[PDB]
Ligand binder design. Structure first.
Ligand SMILES: [Mg+2]
Lengths: 149, 192, 48, 48, 49, 183, 40, 429, 147
């Protein structure tokens, strides 16, 4: 499958420090089941979002259901089944930092995975139990889909 | 190559629109200028009634000049800061400054806010005539515009007195270049 | 009073740590301290 | 004479009437010396 | 107005007459930096015409 | 809702903080508490305590509109084994009625009686030179006197032979200001 | 303050001359006199 | 030591039944204090109630001098949770119904409230739950709105003021909370937060009613109302705020109306307002550059505040120490020394009104530890000793002796001449 | 290219390259620049007079009358000039939307453009180009001549 993390979020806030850039918006979104915070940058111009919106967020290691682990070069002419068929907003980036509440002796209970989609940043901050598919310097898909509920 | 080809799409320019304030910043700049003028008038009044405490280490004239310079420089700095605050993210002066390609904060402040005090040999404009810089002023005038302070910006244009004072300020740069070249040439030759 | 060709002496407080008195404390920190200094306008260096 | 703009800084060139001199080395030894010591890509970092 | 002099003796004809021949062809000379006005006064004597 | 017990425990079960988690009012409504009431006996003490403490922060209109389920939750909190939940329910039971806290802590809380008694003894013992409330910085001398007694001047540690430079300075500045207003 | 930095200073340092424009001393106080202003 | 051994064993071996028996026997022997207490184990009912009671007794045995030290220690352990804070505030409200020294408990509760707000608590709703203000749901909800927002909303103030200045005013306890007045003067007398001259008069009336109005209460029931201080105080506040918030006015313009300024600053709430406005007006380091007088009239105003009112002494001292501890940039060294001399002169003026011990303690602390200039300290001591007379309080000498024991006593007598040196105080010790 | 041109505010420079009318950018109508100068020449030198003259050139050309730039006038300022310009269907600050010459696409940044007076200085490149390989020699010291 290649599903690293999946949950439902609802956007608690938009860019609080002011609109730094015209076409990109900061989203402070918060979870429902696993109770982990999310900081995301989205292209507001082509995928508009508003306050209170809920969406399904599915971080995946690959777009292909069989997990063939594509090389990572743009080949639009591909007829294979993909996850992006049932999602609206899809970005591809790589994870570049994992923090934690590690001590010198005990292990970590809270992690915070940082991923960059070519500039657009996302921090997923939650309990360490759900963040184990994230290894630094690995490619990751976003696969975000707004919910009508 | 790559950036120069993308600039064909993005483009870049600069014009009059990049030098205009939002007509609320102009009020702030005028208010700051009026405050500075009142302050220096007040200090000159105190010197008129002999209340200036001499600085322990400087002459009475020296402490007076230091006071006036401090007030004027603070006024120019405040006006410049307000001008930088007024700039939008679409402005071209700001883009060419923050990129470091050309220009600096003082250039924007002078173009928009105020040119500031002129100086020759590190001092205000000296009394070329008897006790006055120009015949248009009264004798023994140490006020801002009398001694070489430009209260206008390059957009609003300089009045004739401050135009002449700015010419005086600009001449020293060319003179200094013409002397410094020959002064440093011999230094470098001897070092070699 | 004074030494010859010492026209006047300025009393100064260095706000830069370069001329400040930096003394290593008992716990290893550096702890720059600000102390008065003097700047002459003449040179003796022998009686001074 | 036309030259890439990155090298306008070492020369302090201006493209507003500036003139520059070109010397042509005449021997194989001299050409090799220039190529191995004074080519532009070898002068990116200055010892100053 | 607020009394400053009240005892003038002479009045200027026009302040723009302080400029010379070469400098008086510059449009809006009071909006530039002075060295640029000097450079224009220099280069106006080399213009083709 | 769909297993609202886990939802409550995971939204609000921040056991590390004994404080009120943010937006506690927004997490509760008529239906939320209406579903909490029948599943109040499964959740932990920390989640229960956070819910009870946040029920205070709910707006007065919201409290009054759905006050019956609040009474039910408070009653079920009074039957809880944890003494803190008993105490919090005793305090909370007076909110739907009037709004002020239940002052009748005397029942089934001898520790409250002991602390009240010894605090009362210490307060009566130290009613002189007591800590005047910070509001005394503001209200007038008559208002201060009627509120928490008059102002007691600080003890005379010495005798002020002459005024400092402040008095002469203020007199001179008054004279200068009086002369300045005429120009 | 007035120290004449820049090219003239470099020329004085290079052209070793017994008559610098603005000679000076940077006197550091020794002990308790370093703190008190009057004792400076 | 063996008791701590047993406690750490029981921590390491919770399932050890004989360890539990040993803990039981330790509790039996009467040494229950050594088991985890204070802030470590305040989640238990009897333990928290006992430790809170002891800390409250410690505060009340503390006094004015212990206000700065023990109060944060108590506040960090009562606000560790909303349950402990709720118990603390409920007990404070229960005692506050009694005025036989209960003003101390009310003060402790108010300080706990402000510490909780500093930490991040939304404790204003808790405070409204404490007071009778919750009996008016509309006004209580509006107060909760303004205190969670932290701003003076004009519409909310109109809603509140509608209930006031009538035959049915809400209880003064609603309007007497320190947070309301503190935020009010932070928003009003500040050079920012411009008010469009429309609801500002309502703000002035609300402040006048909160501070200058006298309400008589017997058995926590409203008895009588005094409205003597509602016109003069309101006019004073309006005039003061107009002078302060017209920042385009020059210094000379404010100096011109010093007669009415001095008449108006003879009020406590006006004193706090003008003090805070001066605090904001001098906070900018640039202010001294535009200050073309070596001895400000602002300092004389602070002197007037200190002289007329004594309950405001800690605030003036805090401002003075804040100004003293900061190095001023873009000035002269001699100018900074003169400014320090003026600040120490203000310190001596504060010491004049009887507020002596904290100033001397801070002076000693800054001298012996983190040594500042000795000339300033000698000048401060010279000014202090020439304005005090024998006899002296034992504690006053107890704190004033160590400073004069060292640090260039020989230079303390240079050019005074007519009057005897500090040694006389030594003879009088 | 290589010849020297200067504005009336000391903005000298040499021709870098020449493009045909087809390649140069164009306005909504078929107006294409004769001279394109770099923006970076403006900020460090602060020749705001160049910008104001460019702005009032448009007003003078459209209205049909020679503009006035007397040094100390006070009847002429940037605001009035902009208000006059906005009456002829242009942006009041003198910007225009230019289309890329090669691709025909719009440029995301509106470009400042207007009529400005330029001069041709006598320092043409053909009068300066020089090269040598074993030419004439001096007589005293047999070294290559000067000039
Ligand atoms: Mg050049």
């Amino acid at each position: 499958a290649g599903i690293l993390f999946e949950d439902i979020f609802d956007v608690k806030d938009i860019d609080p420090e002011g609109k730094k850039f015209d076409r990109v918006s900061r989203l402070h979104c918060e979870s429902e089941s696993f109770k982990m915070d999310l900081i995301l940058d989205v292209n507001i111009q082509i995928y508009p979002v508003d306050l209170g919106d809920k969406f399904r967020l599915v971080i995946a290691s690959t777009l292909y259901e069989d997990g063939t682990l594509d090389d990572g070069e743009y080949n639009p002419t591909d007829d294979r089944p993909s996850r992006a068929d049932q999602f609206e907003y899809v970005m591809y980036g790589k994870v570049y930092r994992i923090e934690g509440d590690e001590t010198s002796t005990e292990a970590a209970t809270r992690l915070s995975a940082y991923v960059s989609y070519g500039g657009l940043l996302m921090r997923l901050q939650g309990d360490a139990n759900n963040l184990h598919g994230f290894e630094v310097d690995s490619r990751v898909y976003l696969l975000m889909k707004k919910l009508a509920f | 190559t790559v950036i120069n080809n993308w600039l064909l799409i993005e483009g870049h320019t600069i014009g009059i629109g990049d030098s205009i304030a939002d007509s609320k910043t102009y009020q702030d700049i005028q208010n700051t200028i009026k405050k500075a003028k009142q302050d220096v008038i007040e200090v000159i009044e105190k010197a008129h009634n002999n209340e200036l405490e001499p600085t322990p280490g400087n002459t009475l004239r020296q402490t007076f000049e230091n006071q006036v310079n401090r007030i004027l420089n603070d006024a120019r700095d405040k006006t410049g800061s307000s001008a930088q605050k007024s700039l939008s993210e679409y402005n071209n002066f700001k883009s060419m400054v923050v990129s470091g390609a050309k220009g600096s904060k003082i250039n924007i402040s002078q173009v928009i806010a105020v040119v500031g005090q002129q100086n020759v040999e590190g001092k205000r404009i000296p009394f070329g005539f008897k006790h006055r810089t120009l015949p248009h002023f009264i004798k023994d005038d140490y006020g801002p515009e009398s001694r070489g302070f430009v209260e206008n910006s390059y957009l609003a244009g300089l009045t004739p007195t401050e135009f002449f004072f700015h010419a005086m300020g600009g001449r020293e740069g060319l003179i200094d270049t013409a002397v410094k070249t020959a002064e440093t040439g011999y230094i470098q030759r001897r070092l070699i | 009073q004074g030494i010859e060709q010492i026209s006047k002496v300025y009393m100064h407080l260095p706000q830069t740590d370069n001329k400040k008195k930096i003394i290593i404390t008992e716990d290893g920190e550096f702890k720059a301290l600000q102390e008065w200094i003097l700047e002459t306008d003449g040179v003796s260096l022998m009686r001074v | 004479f036309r030259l890439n703009l990155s090298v306008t800084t070492p020369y302090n060139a201006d493209f507003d009437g500036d003139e520059m001199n070109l010397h042509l080395p005449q021997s194989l030894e001299t050409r090799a010396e220039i190529q191995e010591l004074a080519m532009v890509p070898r002068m990116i970092v200055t010892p100053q | 107005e607020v009394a400053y002099c009240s005892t003038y003796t002479h009045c200027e004809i026009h302040p723009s007459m302080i400029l010379g021949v070469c400098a008086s062809i510059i449009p809006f000379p009071d909006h530039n930096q002075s060295p640029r006005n000097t450079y224009q006064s220099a280069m106006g004597k080399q213009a083709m015409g | 809702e769909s297993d609202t017990g886990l939802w409550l425990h995971n939204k609000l079960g921040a056991t590390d903080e004994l404080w009120a988690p943010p937006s506690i009012a927004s997490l509760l409504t008529a239906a939320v508490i209406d579903n909490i009431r029948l599943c109040f006996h499964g959740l932990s003490s920390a989640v229960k305590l956070k819910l009870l403490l946040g029920t205070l922060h709910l707006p007065r209109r919201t409290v009054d509109e759905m006050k019956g389920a609040l009474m039910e939750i408070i009653q079920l909190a009074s039957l809880d084994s944890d003494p803190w939940v008993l105490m919090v329910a005793d305090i909370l039971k007076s909110f739907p009625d009037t709004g002020s806290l239940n002052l009748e802590l005397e029942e089934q809380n001898p520790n409250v009686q002991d602390i009240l008694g010894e605090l009362r003894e210490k307060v009566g013992e130290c009613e002189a030179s007591a800590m005047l409330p910070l509001e005394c910085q503001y209200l007038n001398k008559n208002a201060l006197t009627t509120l928490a007694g008059p102002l007691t001047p600080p003890v005379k540690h010495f005798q002020l032979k002459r005024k400092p430079k402040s008095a002469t300075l203020r007199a001179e500045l008054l004279q200068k200001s009086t002369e300045t207003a005429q120009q | 303050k007035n120290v004449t930095l820049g090219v003239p200073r470099l020329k004085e340092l290079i052209n070793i001359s017994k008559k610098p424009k603005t000679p000076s001393l940077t006197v550091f106080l020794l002990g308790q006199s370093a703190r008190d202003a009057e004792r400076a | 030591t063996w008791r701590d051994l047993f406690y750490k064993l029981a921590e390491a071996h919770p399932d050890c039944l004989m360890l539990n028996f040993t803990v039981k026997l330790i509790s039996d022997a009467g040494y229950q204090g050594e088991i985890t207490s204070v802030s470590t184990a305040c989640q238990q009912l009897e333990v928290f109630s006992r430790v809170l009671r002891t800390s409250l007794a410690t505060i009340l045995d503390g006094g004015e001098e212990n206000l700065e030290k023990n109060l944060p220690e108590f506040a960090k352990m009562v606000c560790h949770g909303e349950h402990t804070y709720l118990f603390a505030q409920a007990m404070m409200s229960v005692l506050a119904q009694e005025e036989q020294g209960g003003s101390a408990v009310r003060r402790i509760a108010q300080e706990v409230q402000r510490f909780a707000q500093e930490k991040g608590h939304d404790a204003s709703q808790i405070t409204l739950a404490l007071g009778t203000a919750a009996s008016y749901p509309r006004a209580c909800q509006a107060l909760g709105a303004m205190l969670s927002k932290g701003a003076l909303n004009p519409a909310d103030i109109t809603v509140l003021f509608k209930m006031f200045t009538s035959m049915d005013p809400p209880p003064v306890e609603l309007i007497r909370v320190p947070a309301f007045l503190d935020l009010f003067m932070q928003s009003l007398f500040k050079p920012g937060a411009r008010i469009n001259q429309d609801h500002k008069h309502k703000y002035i009336h609300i402040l006048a009613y909160a501070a200058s109005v006298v309400e008589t209460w017997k058995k926590n029931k409203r008895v009588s109302i005094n409205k003597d201080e509602l016109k003069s105080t309101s006019k004073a506040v309006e005039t003061v705020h107009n002078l302060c918030c017209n920042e385009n006015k020059g210094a000379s313009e404010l100096v011109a109306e010093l007669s009415t300024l001095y008449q108006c600053i003879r009020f406590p709430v006006v004193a706090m307002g003008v003090l805070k406005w001066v605090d904001w007006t001098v906070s900018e380091p640039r202010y001294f550059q535009l200050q073309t007088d070596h001895t400000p009239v602002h300092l004389a105003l602070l002197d007037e505040i200190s002289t007329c009112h004594q309950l405001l002494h800690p605030q003036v001292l805090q401002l003075l120490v804040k100004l003293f501890e900061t190095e001023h940039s873009q000035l002269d060294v001699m100018e900074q020394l003169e400014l320090k001399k003026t600040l120490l002169d203000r310190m001596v003026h504060l010491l004049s009104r009887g507020y002596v011990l904290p100033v001397v303690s801070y002076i000693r602390k800054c001298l012996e530890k983190l040594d500042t200039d000795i000339s300033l300290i000698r000048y401060f001591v010279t000014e202090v000793l020439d304005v005090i007379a024998p006899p002296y309080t034992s504690d006053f000498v107890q704190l004033f002796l160590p400073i004069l024991e060292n640090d260039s006593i020989a230079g303390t007598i240079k050019t005074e001449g007519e009057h005897d040196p500090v040694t006389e105080f030594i003879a009088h010790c | 290219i290589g010849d020297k041109f200067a504005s009336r505010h000391g903005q000298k420079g040499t021709c870098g390259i020449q493009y045909r009318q087809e390649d140069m950018p164009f306005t909504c109508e078929g107006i294409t620049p004769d001279i394109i100068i770099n923006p970076h020449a403006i900020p460090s030198r602060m020749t705001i007079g160049h910008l104001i003259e460019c702005l009032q050139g448009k007003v003078s050309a459209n209205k049909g009358e020679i503009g006035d730039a007397t040094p100390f006038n006070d009847a002429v300022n940037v605001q009035k000039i902009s208000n006059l310009l906005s009456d002829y269907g242009y942006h009041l600050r003198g910007n225009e939307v230019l289309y890329n010459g090669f691709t025909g696409r719009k440029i995301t940044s509106q470009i400042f453009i207007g009529p400005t007076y330029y001069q041709r200085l006598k320092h043409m490149v053909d009068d300066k180009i020089h090269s040598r390989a074993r030419g004439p020699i001096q007589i005293l010291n047999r070294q290559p001549m000067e000039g």
